[PDB]
Amino acid sequence: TTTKYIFVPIATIGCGKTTVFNTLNNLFPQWTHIQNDNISKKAKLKICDLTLLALEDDDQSVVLFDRNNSASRERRQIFTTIDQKRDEHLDDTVDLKYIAINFIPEDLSEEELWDITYNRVIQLDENLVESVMKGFIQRYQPINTSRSPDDQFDHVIHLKLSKDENSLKSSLENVRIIIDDLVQNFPDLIKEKPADELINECFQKALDYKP
Numbered sequence: 001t002t003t004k005y006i007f008v009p010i011a012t013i014g015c016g017k018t019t020v021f022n023t024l025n026n027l028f029p030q031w032t033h034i035q036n037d038n039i040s041k042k043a044k045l046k047i048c049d050l051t052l053l054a055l056e057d058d059d060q061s062v063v064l065f066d067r068n069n070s071a072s073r074e075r076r077q078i079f080t081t082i083d084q085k086r087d088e089h090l091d092d093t094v095d096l097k098y099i100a101i102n103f104i105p106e107d108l109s110e111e112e113l114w115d116i117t118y119n120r121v122i123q124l125d126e127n128l129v130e131s132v133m134k135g136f137i138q139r140y141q142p143i144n145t146s147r148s149p150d151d152q153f154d155h156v157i158h159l160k161l162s163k164d165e166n167s168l169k170s171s172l173e174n175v176r177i178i179i180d181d182l183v184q185n186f187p188d189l190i191k192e193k194p195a196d197e198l199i200n201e202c203f204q205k206a207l208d209y210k211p
Contacts, residue, residue, distance in 0.1 A: 003095045004055045005062045010143045011103035012070050013136050014117040016171035021064040022209050023175045026202035027194055036067035048081040052089035070140040076149035097154040104161055106142040120167040157181045172203050
């Protein structure tokens with residue numbers, strides 16, 4: 001029994017998920033960060049193929065599955081497709097664990113989810129940014145692990161999302177939340193939280209990553 005992991009965000013635009021995943025991958029370079037926005041719609045290998053490819057080796061334990069998955073259908077598509085394809089990549093005794101990274105607290109209404117997301121991204125254009133990122137926010141369906149598809153998650157990490165905070169201060173706190181929760185729950189992945197100076201350095205280097 002080797003155990004493999006897929007980290008699945010539940011998020012919308014402006015939740016900082018790529019910053020968070022980039023920071024974690026900087027801290028743990030053996031993890032693989034697969035970005036949906038970098039895969040062609042006509043690519044032969046899609047994100048679920050690439051995810052399982054990046055779990056084939058004994059060196060390969062974690063995939064950061066970088067996609068919003070705002071609607072329940074998208075989480076169901078992950079579970080269905082990975083289950084259908086895993087035999088092409090893993091033997092079927094391998095324990096594959098899905099970890100939800102929940103960027104949006106389930107208490108949040110449709111309305112300050114909008115007000116938080118709207119204000120984080122503006123702090124020139126706004127025609128594009130108001131009722132067209134409200135196509136994004138309308139399709140959000142909170143995680144609900146009491147029924148399908150979200151009941152297939154093995155674990156849920158609950159992140160912070162505050163009206164109050166700067167969007168970059170919140171992303172750094174979320175990185176820390178994920179690490180500490182993994183320390184408690186999956187010591188095979190992280191035995192102890194890295195030094196804070198290391199986490200800060202890896203976060204600052206992620207804030208420069210779009211080269």
